[PDB]
Amino acid sequence: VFYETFVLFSKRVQRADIRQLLKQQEALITKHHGSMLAVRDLGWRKTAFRVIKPRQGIFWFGRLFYFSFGANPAAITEMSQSLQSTNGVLRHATVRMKKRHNLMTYNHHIHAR
């Protein structure tokens, strides 16, 4: 079924790295009989509290990214472990794609009225 992943980058992440990261991911998708949906960006985001990640340093903000995909359910574990090894990525989460609530079909009239 469909899946969603929210990746929070750091200040030390250039556009070079972002393209590389996404290319790697697509390998797995195809492996498991899948296809990418769409890739979007959310810009920067302010963090409530300082993030202290070992062997990385301390950061106060980062770049939030979002990308949708679809593959076999067994591919979630492989993807999750790959992100953790790679540098730059300080925090990430995978959320299953719902029917009504989604970032694709439901993105308007949230805060207003």
Partner: protein, 58 residues
Amino acid sequence: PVVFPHTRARAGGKPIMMRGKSGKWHWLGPYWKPPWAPSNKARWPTGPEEWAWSDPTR
């Protein structure tokens, strides 16, 4: 047509919580409706509120 109700007895047993410092259920969890419970209409006469959601398709 005329048909009579069936027996209320069903398979399984009553909910049981494992003893000891490790809190865990054995057969059933807290959300278990016994076969002798009353109808839902009488238990919740108030019904959904005005501010409640009309679509629980989460």
